[PDB]
């Protein structure tokens, strides 16, 4: 069957893009987000002359820090940089270009050795790397594809979805013909797994998982009933305003414009795009809480309403006797250390709300209601 | 209107580091940068003939020049040389 997000008026895509436009003017390497540039180009919207400055900043930071910095960019971020090249109808090319690709191949190679095991980063970053290479018609050895192939422990819908995109590119490109029959089993089984993860509300395991799940579902012909269930689901959550995160917005706009990452095989840089154009009194009290450490920390912190979990953590630090550390990511501040303890290998500091329910947004997007308790938990994964 | 360390592409008006001026790569839209110009390896690895980089034997003849001198891709299409 068939998987369709019907046509919509300009305004829901309009305001969804108004949450992207401020980032277009934040060109510090700390903030440059290739995923954003890709989703704009793949969208119904545009930012005009800003897009060329935004691309230039990427080609500046990424090429200078990896071929010549302050740390990073990451190899996975390099994969997204390649997608941005396609998004501008370019093939990675030249002397600087050739070196970048070999770097990203080395990543795929290091990760393959470590598996022998887990990868040091993620199976998501692993398939994201294969898919960028395949989008510039660069090939990776059959042995590299094999690590991905076997990976379909248990995986989120995003992970399978990105794997699916990597395999769809391999098939459509006739790459790695040594495994042809196995890519299509993997594509098949990736499909069957995403449908199982459909929640009763209609989402493929989360609202945030649904954009990518739809991109992968959109490429390979229960199917449409699930995809209608998906669109209601998605549409309700846009009216509830669930999409505030730039990266999430950038993975969802392509779907709203009927595109996926696989459309970067054959980029359409000319199709016209609509031009994007640009306090509370209350004080609420959130109880921030950490139980993975002994003796546990639990305190109520008083901040203005509309504050984020980030706003709370700062305030708990200011009042004394609470510390945490974050690091930058394409999705915003990532929580790395809490109270001197840092997430180890295969560990992360998970965020939850009452009752024992993991948050679907990070410390700088979740805005707690008056009285909600927020957990930071050191969990294995 | 470019800082002292960068060269400004004549047409686009954008700023490009001097490392990129005259490197055989067209980094400005018009090409201003390029005009007016002028230890051992492991078991299953392989050495680029003119550079000291190591690359796994599987990147030999794979379609992409993984060496600076492109030597990994030289002999492909014929036995030996």
């Amino acid at each position, epitope marked *: 069957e068939m998987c369709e997000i019907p046509e919509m008026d300009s305004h829901l895509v309009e305001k969804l893009g108004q949450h992207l436009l401020p980032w277009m003017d934040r060109l510090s390497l700390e903030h440059l987000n290739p995923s954003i540039y890709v989703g704009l180009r793949l969208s119904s919207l545009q930012a005009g002359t800003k897009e060329d400055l935004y691309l230039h900043s990427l080609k500046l930071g990424y090429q200078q820090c990896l071929l010549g910095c302050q740390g990073k960019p990451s190899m996975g971020q390099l994969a997204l940089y390649l997608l941005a090249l396609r998004a501008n109808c370019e093939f990675v090319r030249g002397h600087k270009g050739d070196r970048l690709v070999s770097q990203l191949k080395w990543f795929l190679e290091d990760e393959k050795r470590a598996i022998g095991g887990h990868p040091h980063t993620s199976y998501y970053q692993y398939g994201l790397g294969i898919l960028a290479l395949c989008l510039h018609q660069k090939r990776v050895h059959d042995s590299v594809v094999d690590k991905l192939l076997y990976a379909v422990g248990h995986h989120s819908v995003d992970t399978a979805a990105m794997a699916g995109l990597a395999f769809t590119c391999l098939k459509r490109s006739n790459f790695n013909p040594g495994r042809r029959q196995r890519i299509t089993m993997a594509i098949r089984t990736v499909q069957e797994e995403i449908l199982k993860a459909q929640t009763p509300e209609g989402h493929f395991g989360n609202v945030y998982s649904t954009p990518l799940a739809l991109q992968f579902l959109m490429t390979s012909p229960e199917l449409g009933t699930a995809c209608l269930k998906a669109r209601v689901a998605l549409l309700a959550s846009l009216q509830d305003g669930a999409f505030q995160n730039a990266l999430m917005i950038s993975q969802l706009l392509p779907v709203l414009n009927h595109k996926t990452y696989i459309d970067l095989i054959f980029p359409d840089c000319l199709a016209p795009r609509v031009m994007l154009e640009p306090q509370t009194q209350e004080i609420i009290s959130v109880t921030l809480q950490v139980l993975s450490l002994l003796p546990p920390y639990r305190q109520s912190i008083s901040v203005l309403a509309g504050s984020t979990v980030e706003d709370v953590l700062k305030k708990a630090h200011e009042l004394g006797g609470f510390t945490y550390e974050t690091q930058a990511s394409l999705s915003g501040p990532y929580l790395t250390s809490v109270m001197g303890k840092a997430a180890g290998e295969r560990e992360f500091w998970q965020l939850l709300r009452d009752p024992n329910t993991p948050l679907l947004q990070g410390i700088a997007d979740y805005r707690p209601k008056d009285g909600e308790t927020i957990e930071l938990r050191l969990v294995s994964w | 209107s470019c800082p002292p360390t960068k060269f400004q592409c004549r047409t686009s008006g954008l700023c490009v580091p001097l490392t990129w001026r005259c490197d055989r790569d067209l980094d400005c839209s018009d090409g201003s940068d390029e005009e007016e110009c002028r230890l051992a390896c492991l078991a299953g690895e392989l050495r680029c003939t003119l550079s*000291d980089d190591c690359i796994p034997l599987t990147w030999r003849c794979d379609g992409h020049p993984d060496c600076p001198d492109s030597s990994d891709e030289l002999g492909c299409g014929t036995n030996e040389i």
Partner: nanobody
Framework: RQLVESGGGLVQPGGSLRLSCAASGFTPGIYDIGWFRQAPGKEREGVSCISSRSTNYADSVKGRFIISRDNVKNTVYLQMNSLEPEDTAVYYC??????????????????WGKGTPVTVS
């Protein structure tokens, strides 16, 4: 495979030491290598590191310990000078692929060694 530390042993303050990180199954040019120390009852700290394709030191070590690579060996040496008591710890070397310009001091490397005990009186 993995990497092995040695060269560590008892000395008295004002002394010299040389720690040896010998790296087996790693392609010569492509990884960052770094030395990390954990003293008893203390978080692991970043000491020194050698760049993939340059050097970074931790400022407590400024002018004291110096990293270097032996061209035949594929080993990296942390040469230890001007010893004081709080430089007592076990010392680990580690390997990460991060072609970003520098090596990093933050404790996120992907391949870790066993550690070699260095104590001082």
């Amino acid at each position: 495979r993995q990497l092995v530390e040695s060269g560590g042993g008892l000395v008295q303050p004002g002394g010299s030491l040389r720690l040896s990180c010998a790296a087996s199954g790693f392609t010569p040019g492509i990884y960052d290598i770094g030395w990390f120390r954990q003293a008893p009852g203390k978080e692991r700290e970043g000491v020194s590191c050698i760049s993939s394709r340059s050097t970074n030191y931790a400022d407590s070590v400024k002018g004291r310990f110096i990293i270097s690579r032996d061209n035949v060996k594929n080993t990296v040496y942390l040469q230890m000078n001007s010893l004081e008591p709080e430089d007592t710890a076990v010392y680990y070397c580690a390997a990460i692929y991060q072609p970003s310009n520098g090596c990093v001091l933050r404790p996120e490397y992907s391949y870790w060694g066993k550690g070699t005990p260095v104590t001082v009186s």
